[PDB]
């Protein structure tokens, strides 16, 4: 079904952000795992798989609207070197993506592409959950201390 | 069956206390939950459903005694900002209420409303348990330390 | 994540509404239960837990948006003395509440707080169903008569 | 297998009636359920489904006989405003059809379409059961009074 | 609950379209099955049912909104003579109604009937799925040839 | 019980028809089976066991009516050499028999042998089904092509 | 454990190749599925999930050898517009990656990094299966024909 050209661009924009979140979280995930931070690793891993599913939904939607998904452009990944940093990189990421999503949702409303809007709304709801977990981890670190926090993430 | 007017005034009195407890603990529960303090949040949550059961019992008792339950008044809520403060507020709350319960059990005895006395006695035994747990946490905080005590409340 | 101050203000207001419903429906529930009107008390009981869930969702959303939930203020409960009056009071409360829900959804739209909009929409759809049942009963009372209606509610 | 032009003409006619029954009963079913008359609702709902299986039987027989089903035209639709009237309108229709079926069975006999006859015969027996139930409901209203009948159709 | 006259007017309009879908899909389904194309028949049969659930949702909304469902008027019916055309007539219908759903959701939003909106919203997502399947069948006919496509729809 | 002499002559008549069908379909079945046309062979096989059941019914009916079943005469067998021919032969066979069945049902009616009429009516309804399937295959052959139609009959 | 700088450069290179395939196979996969070619889509999907696992194995190896996995560089994706081209694009990828794996294995052998060589041999064996499958589908297309091949890929 022929979709809106500008709507397809927003979708590709959102898709671009997702592909980045995918590699960054996967790498981070395997890093925690490599440090012996199993709990932290398993959670970062799922965050990765979620982003993969977001990418999947977007791709399918774009194909349905008769557009061309763009998996060719990979933006700058924000890799960290230590836990507190990695958390803050994922946070910067998730945040930087909110303006694009709300701008995409707002555009779909304006052109009557309500299904795409519901799609982006779901993903959005999911992005706010990640942002929440992340903030919580950072607060937890300041509350119980890096040593205790990292001990809690082993196994 | 028409009950003693003063006994019902007492019941409504204690009822207002519980209603406060309900709100205070539910907010504290969602706050812990929100800070990622799983354990604390779960306990405070139950303490809350507990107070609801207490309120429920009094309501029924009042209704039976042919009085009018007062779910209209809600006293000051002692909301803490950080864990130790929140625990102290709940303890202070559970203690300011005991005198009233005892003054009520004492009264039922004086006018022979033995059944209402058994109701309060039960609510009472629970209250000394809510207080027991609370006092325990406060002492743990001083024995293992806040950071350690918080850490252990995470999962 | 810091949310819109006006959105949180809206949310907090709706929270007060729910808290009112909880108490009103709970009293009505125990009253029906107290008159031997099992069916009615059972339903009213559920309508009450429903409102408790609503309140819980708003609280959590408010906390996430980093605001202070208000379990403190409690509005005027509309208590009835007889079945028909009790149904009216509840319908009245559920209706004098919609304008606020809609004014809030509309607001979230204006500031792009789409996730809060979804929260409100859900409880909104639930509210129209509470209103449906209520109206359904009121009309029923006039179709089969009060005596028959009450009889039906006993068992 | 080419069948008699006139036999198919009857089949087509019978079919229009079913399509009418379908919509009419479907509307009464939702109306009943909208008023809170579960018992009446479910029955009208199933009767609606019954009429759907009837139409389905005809469409197939017609297609097989190499004719063109006319799902296009829909005749008058006796919609009622109250139970009593809705029950009567459903009985008028359920009767205004009998002749057609009876008339169609006689026709099939005269031209040797025995298979079409037995098929109609079946819808015919079923229709006499839609009528028995309807006439019974109306009589019941007399024997126990409207408000009583309704009270029975609630749950 | 009294709803907006214009919103109920849209709902009523949307409802007519579904009733058409129901009949057109049901006829095609029997035709397919009559020719021996089981797969095609089974799918049209399901799409026929889907449309019935759509119409049922509207009817309830309309009744709840205190309007009068119009099961009476039935729009024209795009009947096809062969698969290729039958598939096209069904795609046209699904597209000649998509705008209405879009036009209705926009209306509900402008007058605050958020509940009706989410209801149309769903039928809408579903209809984009009916359309995706139809477009796919047509494209498949191209890529593999009518004879192969039909051969694959047999068993 | 002594039956009508003409009714029995009819029964024996139709009986001879079935016996032919039995042989024709069994040979056609083993021929398909032999050509590796699994599906066709299986269907033709059942159509054959069917005709056996028909013959069985008539035999019993004749025996009851106190007549002598004639399994002695066997008419011309229409054996095809290739698929389409075989289908046409079976169709031609199933059609030359219908007039006789109808002429027999008609006769039973005239002499009041209603039970024998029900027997024929059933055999009749099956016959229009054997014809339905056969006509379907012939049309499929012309829609997807012989090679394609044969291919699909292999497994 | 510190690994050989060049072994790591090789590992990073293979990783880059895997990362390309992931996206190419995932886009091709959703494309087949968007066209209704379920068989093909499901296969490409799995081959894509395979590359993901491959990349995962390398990421881990690299982290263990204390190097920095590079998920930032993304080579040129070869995306086709129709099945045959898409199959040829993936085959080209696999082939263009074979030299690099063999080069890497050979280097690990020259510096005593046997565990890294073992890992690579495994991925190598997996890559020859993808190739065998791709070459086979292309041959299958020549033996039976695009129309038939595509039909076979439908379900
Ligand atoms: C007049 C005050 C209230 C009364 C009498 C009341 C009573 C109850 C009762 C008896 C239950 C059943 C619990 C069980 O035994 O499993 C319940 C459940 C619950 N209450 Fe309350 N409640 C009150 C206020 C509140 C408030 C203000 C909140 C939130 C701030 C709340 C939130 C809940 C929740 C979430 C549940 C669990 C519901 C579920 O089972 O899914 N309640 N309440
Ligand atoms: C236009 C108004 C119609 C409405 C509102 C309606 C509604 C429904 C609903 C809600 C169901 C049950 C769906 C499920 O749970 O699976 C149903 C089933 C069905 N409908 Fe309709 N329908 C309509 C018209 C028709 C017509 C005109 C036909 C035939 C031409 C038809 C034939 C059927 C059949 C065969 C079933 C399945 C029955 C069974 O499984 O026992 N419907 N319909
Ligand atoms: C174009 C980007 C990618 C897309 C669209 C994608 C999509 C997916 C999807 C749909 C799944 C299934 C999710 C589930 O049901 O659990 C999956 C699984 C997985 N992905 Fe990705 N993925 C991508 C990139 C990656 C990358 C870059 C890696 C690793 C560096 C990766 C590693 C994995 C793993 C390990 C699994 C699960 C494997 C298993 O099933 O055992 N993915 N991916
Ligand atoms: Fe995401
Ligand atoms: Fe995210
Ligand atoms: Fe510790
Ligand atoms: Fe208590
Ligand atoms: Fe307590
Ligand atoms: Fe509510
Ligand atoms: Fe409510
Ligand atoms: Fe009927
Ligand atoms: Fe009927
Ligand atoms: Fe629809
Ligand atoms: Fe549709
Ligand atoms: Fe036979
Ligand atoms: Fe036969
Ligand atoms: Fe690979
Ligand atoms: Fe590969
Ligand atoms: Mg939504
Ligand atoms: Mg926070
Ligand atoms: Mg009493
Ligand atoms: Mg035919
Ligand atoms: Mg008969
Ligand atoms: Mg109503
Ligand atoms: Mg398409
Ligand atoms: Mg004998
Ligand atoms: Mg290490």
Swiss-Prot record, chains A, B, C, D, E, F, G:
Residues annotated for Fe cation 1 binding in this entry: 18, 51, 54, 127
EC nos: 1.16.3.1
Alphabetically ordered keywords of this record: Heme, Ion transport, Iron, Iron storage, Iron transport, Metal-binding, Oxidoreductase, Transport
GO molecular function: ferric iron binding; ferroxidase activity; heme binding
Class in the EC hierarchy, top level: oxidoreductase
GO CC terms in record: cytosol
Subunit text: Homooligomer of 24 subunits, arranged as 12 dimers, that are packed together to form an approximately spherical molecule with a central cavity, in which large amounts of iron can be deposited.
Protein name from the UniProt record: Bacterioferritin
Protein's organism: Azotobacter vinelandii
Lineage, opening ranks: Bacteria, Pseudomonadati, Pseudomonadota, Gammaproteobacteria, Pseudomonadales
Gene: bfr
